[PDB]
Design a protein around this ligand. Structure first.
Ligand SMILES: [Mg+2]
Ligand SMILES: [Mg+2]
Ligand SMILES: [Zn+2]
Ligand SMILES: [Zn+2]
Lengths: 56, 98, 168, 65, 189, 49, 49, 38
DNA sequence: GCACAAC
RNA sequence: AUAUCA
DNA sequence: GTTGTGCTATGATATTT
């Protein structure tokens, strides 16, 4: 995570198969290619903490 | 003349399975040699009949090689800190070419 | 400073002994038991102490005491720091050097860099990413398996009370 | 590891054509392109299927118990 | 542990290790939340780290059955070390050194097993047989080199390592009838 | 199949394409801890275990 | 309907590598923790964070 | 100065296919019976 | 193996 | 500790 | 002038005593 666009708040879509799926135009700031790259998800636990994600 | 190339592959050597075992066996045999001497003193003092089986410790060279080959720290276990690790890896069996 | 930091306290006279949490023990199977390196290093300090105490009490042979003092000096010193320049390391049977206190705080993976300034966390997940042109920009495809594991503790109010009862 | 039944890509039954193939190369002494054509492997998806198959099962059979 | 809500005498409880919880299988009440991995925790005591790079490796395993509880490190050479201070601090350990010395009879058993080509499990039974019978009044005054020669056949007779008594007569020493009576007064203990 | 990923014929997959066998081997010892303590191979009963 | 462009097409030798997704995917909302630091344990196989 | 056998010393691990290994002078059919891959 | 910091 | 992954 | 002293990419995963 080299800059703040390497952590961005997303909107869950529950889908099948074992991959995280992201829109391609969002590849540029995560610097992700799909050659076996893995990524990290963190779930906020507070009503307050999700507001920080969604608003900021 | 010009400064010698420190990278010239001709002025390099490769220590393979032979010499690696030779290096280890030397330090392992001098380990045994000087443990027999410690015994010859102990058995000439009390004239306890220099029993051969008591004199030579087989486990010295046996487990001394087994350690190196297993773990990979090419030295004794003493000494397992100051000894170079990396020699002896578990062989790849992914694909025949690997 | 007259209250918190006087020069005379740079010299150790009494030794605070940390409690088990700082140096955990483990009791495996009645013939296997694991003690922390600190518990080892402490026992040496103690043994070296008990020794020097007996020497002073008895007929003090001057040079056999200062010989035992600079042993105590070593064990106490090596316990806070084992990576000392000039001095031999205290080693632990297997040839490995004792993990001093200094060394637990020090590096990345230390208590600072690796347990406080960054730490692993719950409610997290990781997997392979793949591209999807049929998602929105701000969405993310989450495998049903992960979504079933990860949790959000919503609080029951009379708004969600019906919905939550169905979930339960 | 045994001739696959059915070509991957297109799905023509290809697993019945093995013994018949090796006969064309051994008994009749035809070259491969000709043999594959005689068999009825028209499109290259089915040709690669037989042309490329390695019969390891024959190696595995050599171990006794 | 027993569920405070239910209380049935056979307390049926599960260790849902994966969620790190201890649950009552009947009512489902969680009885504990802090739960630790014992495998990985034991990895911190007995590891493969001999070099000294692992920050996880922070302790060492000991054997309270054989050597009691004698915690003690050894002054040795490190990376930046003068060969002078090692000698002094070691010559200083010499002045600090009876039954705390009869543990060198373990060194007699270890050097006998290695001369008899015996496994690591046999030595530790011979050392436990010797620790629990060398100060007995039932053995009283038996030939002290024939009671440790008898505790090696006691350690072999449990570790399933076939060693005849005449095989240990060749090692040391053994006086036959002397280490045969001693192999029985211990066998009763 | 954008950005290094790729599409694969799900029908071809069914017909055998790129399937593989997988074998993992689990080991276990029956260790002897001194004069008395010995591990055992058995089906544990939940009341005394 | 025809594609307006023509496509490069043909056999290419392709290798099935290690790293399958079901050997990597990993989620954890609370679970085992280290005994020293009381933080989660490390490793997919330890069910850590 | 006037004056008044063969001993085991250790077990050395052998490298497979070496002179000392059983598999060195082994034929193809031989290896198969030995449950080794040629 | 740096590169800069104190003896 | 080695190997490896982007 | 010489010595001596800190550090030297992020996360992940799989074995071996
Ligand atoms: Mg990339
Ligand atoms: Mg890119
Ligand atoms: Zn086809
Ligand atoms: Zn209950």
């Amino acid at each position: 995570s080299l800059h703040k666009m390497s952590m961005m708040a997303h909107r869950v879509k529950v889908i099948p198969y074992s991959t995280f799926r992201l829109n391609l135009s969002v590849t540029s700031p995560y610097n992700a290619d799909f050659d076996g790259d893995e990524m990290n998800l963190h779930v906020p636990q507070s009503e307050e903490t999700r507001a920080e994600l969604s608003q900021l | 003349k010009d400064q010698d190339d420190r990278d010239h592959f001709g002025k390099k050597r490769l220590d393979l399975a032979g010499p690696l075992l030779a290096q280890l066996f030397k330090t392992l045999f001098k380990k045994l040699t000087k443990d027999i001497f410690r015994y010859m003193q102990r058995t000439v003092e009390e004239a306890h009949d220099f029993n051969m089986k008591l004199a030579i410790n087989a486990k010295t060279i046996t487990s001394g090689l087994k350690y190196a080959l297993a773990t990979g720290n090419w030295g004794e276990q003493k000494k397992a800190m100051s000894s170079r690790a990396g020699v002896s890896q578990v062989l790849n069996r992914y694909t025949y070419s690997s | 400073n007259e209250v918190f930091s006087r020069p005379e306290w740079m010299i150790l006279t009494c030794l605070p002994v940390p409690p088990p949490p700082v140096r955990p023990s483990i009791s495996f199977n009645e013939s296997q038991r694991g003690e922390d390196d600190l518990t080892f290093k402490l026992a040496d300090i103690l043994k070296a102490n008990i020794s020097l105490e007996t020497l002073e009490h008895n007929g003090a042979p001057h040079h056999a005491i200062e010989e035992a003092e600079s042993l105590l000096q070593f064990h106490v010193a090596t316990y806070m720091d084992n990576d000392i320049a000039g001095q031999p390391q205290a080693l632990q049977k297997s040839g490995r050097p004792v993990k001093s206190i200094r060394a637990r705080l020090k590096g990345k993976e230390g208590r600072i860099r690796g347990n406080l300034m960054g730490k692993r966390v719950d409610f997290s997940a990781r997997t392979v990413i793949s591209g999807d042109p049929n998602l929105e920009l701000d969405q993310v495809g989450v495998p049903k398996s992960i979504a079933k594991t990860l949790t959000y503790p919503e609080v029951v109010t009379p708004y969600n009370i019906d919905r939550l009862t169905q979930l339960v | 590891m045994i001739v696959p039944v059915r070509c991957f890509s297109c799905g023509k039954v290809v697993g019945d054509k093995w013994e018949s193939y090796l006969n064309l190369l051994q008994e009749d002494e035809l070259d491969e392109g000709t043999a594959l054509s005689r068999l009825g492997l028209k499109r290259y998806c089915c040709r690669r299927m037989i042309l490329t198959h390695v019969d390891l099962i024959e190696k595995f059979l050599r171990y006794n118990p | 542990l027993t569920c405070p809500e239910c209380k049935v005498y056979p307390p049926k409880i599960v260790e849902r290790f994966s969620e790190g919880d201890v649950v009552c299988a009947l009512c489902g009440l969680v009885l504990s939340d802090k739960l630790v991995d014992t495998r990985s925790e034991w990895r911190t005591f007995s590891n493969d780290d001999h070099n000294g790079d692992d920050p996880s490796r922070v302790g060492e395993a000991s054997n309270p059955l054989l050597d009691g509880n004698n915690l003690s490190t050894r002054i040795g050479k490190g990376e930046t070390t003068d060969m002078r201070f090692t000698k002094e601090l070691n010559k200083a350990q010499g002045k600090n050194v009876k039954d705390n010395e009869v543990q060198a009879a373990f060194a007699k058993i270890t050097m006998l097993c290695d001369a008899a080509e015996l496994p690591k499990i046999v030595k530790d039974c011979a050392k436990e047989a010797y620790k629990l019978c060398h100060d007995e009044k039932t053995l009283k005054g038996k030939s002290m080199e024939s009671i440790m020669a008898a505790s090696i056949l006691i350690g072999c007779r449990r570790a399933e390592v076939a060693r005849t008594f005449k095989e240990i007569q060749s090692l040391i020493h053994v006086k036959t009838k002397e280490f045969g009576k001693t192999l029985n007064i211990m066998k009763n203990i | 199949n954008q950005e290094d990923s790729m599409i694969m014929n799900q029908s071809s997959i069914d017909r055998g394409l790129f399937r593989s066998l997988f074998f993992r081997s689990y080991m276990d010892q029956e260790k002897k801890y001194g004069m008395s303590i010995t591990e055992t191979f058995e089906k544990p009963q939940r009341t005394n275990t | 309907k025809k594609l307006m462009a023509q496509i490069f097409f043909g056999p290419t030798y392709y290798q099935r590598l290690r790293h399958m997704v079901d050997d990597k995917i990993h989620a954890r909302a609370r679970g085992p923790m280290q005994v020293l630091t009381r933080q989660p344990v490390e490793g997919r196989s330890r069910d850590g964070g | 100065k006037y004056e008044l056998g063969k001993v085991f010393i250790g077990r050395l691990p052998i490298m497979l296919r070496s002179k000392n290994c059983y598999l060195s002078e082994a034929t193809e059919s031989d290896l198969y019976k030995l449950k080794e891959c040629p």
